Amino acid sequence: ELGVQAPVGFWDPVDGNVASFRRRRTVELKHGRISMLAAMGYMTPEITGKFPGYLSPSTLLKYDDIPNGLGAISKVPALGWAQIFVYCGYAELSQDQTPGSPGAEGNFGFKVLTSSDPDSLEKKLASEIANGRLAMMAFTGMATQDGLTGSAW
């Protein structure tokens, strides 16, 4: 059920239970979301440029001066990425997995699945997790590229 895919089965040459799988599923979907955000997030300081601007703390009218895939810092936007880190925690402590009764359901705040286009279960739940797995490898592979093989593109 759920994230069981098509090209492979349970792909468990190492969980394999119910409660332990549920916690592992929450980790899997969670890591999937970030990679998809990070992967599309990394392509944007590329084409369309380092889009940002406007009056920021110690970064007023900063055109996203955090360059390169790692972002570096030097008081350029990457220090502001800590605000992203802080506010990411706020959503991680308010809309979290302790009251997240299913695997990684946040009650669908946007209601995108209320016929707006996504659907409950079936391919959509399987498509989300499968896409997350691809992005996680893509983001890690992109990390290797920036480190010792130039930049993204």
Which chain residues interact with another protein by CB under 8 A? 93-94, 96, 98-99
* Coil vs helix vs strand at 80: helix
Q: Given the complex with ligand CLA, which of 3 and 125 has the nearer CB atom?
A: 3
Phi–psi pair at 44, nearest 5 degrees: -80, -40
73 makes contact, choosing from ligand CLA, a copy of itself, another protein, none, with CB < 5 to 8 Å by partner type, with a copy of itself
Residue 74 contact partner, candidates ligand CLA, a copy of itself, another protein, none, CB within 5 to 8 A by sort of partner: a copy of itself
> Would the CA dihedral through 105, 106, 112, 113 be positive or negative?
positive
* CB closer to another protein, 19 vs 47: 19
Using CB under 8 A as the binding rule, whether residue 70 contacts a copy of itself is answered as yes
Nearest Cα to Cα of residue 120 among 129, 109, 112: 112
Q: Sign of dihedral through CA atoms 132, 127, 129, 85?
A: positive
Query: ∠ at Cα 38 (34, 42), nearest 5°?
Result: 180
| Site residues, ligand CLA (CB under 6 A) | 3-5, 8, 10-12, 14-15, 21, 24-25, 27-28, 31, 34, 37-38, 40-41, 44-45, 50-52, 64, 66, 71, 77-78, 80-81, 84, 133, 136-137
